[PDB]
Ligand binder design. Structure first.
Ligand SMILES: CNC(=O)c1cc(C(=O)N[C@H]2[C@@H]3COC[C@@H]32)cc([C@@H](C)c2ccccc2)n1
Length: 113
């Protein structure tokens, strides 16, 4: 019942909410890795050096990869940053990223001390 364990339980709660039916209308583009070939995005891996998605975050949490809340938050924010770097700001996927990041940042802020 340490501080790191407690903060990682809060992180796991956030991850479960991001994957829940409540947010599915805007969360679904972030469920699995970007399939660049399938979407015709043949420049994606030249522009994005570190791809990230919620299935990879879930795998790392299940494997006890994350040692603290800051490491978890860095991967979730990397996922949003990749979206803002690659996509024009008027694409629907950017509006969806903005909405899911608002859910993330407001609950992350309620981290137990
Ligand atoms: C994480 N996902 C993405 O970054 C992404 C990018 C693009 C995409 O085509 N981006 C190309 C824009 C014009 O040329 C350069 C950027 C399409 C989609 C798909 C799944 C999609 C998402 C939401 C609503 C409809 C469709 N996701």
């Amino acid at each position: 019942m340490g501080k790191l364990s407690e903060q990682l339980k809060h992180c796991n709660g956030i991850l479960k909410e991001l994957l829940s039916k409540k947010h599915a209308a805007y969360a679904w583009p972030f469920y699995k890795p970007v399939d660049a070939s399938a979407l015709g995005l043949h420049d994606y891996h030249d522009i994005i050096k570190h791809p990230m998605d919620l299935s990879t975050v879930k795998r790392k949490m299940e494997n006890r990869d994350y040692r603290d809340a800051q490491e978890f938050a860095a991967d979730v924010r990397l996922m949003f940053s990749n979206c803002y770097k690659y996509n024009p700001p008027d694409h629907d996927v950017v509006a969806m990223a903005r909405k899911l990041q608002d859910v993330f940042e407001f609950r992350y802020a309620k981290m137990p001390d």
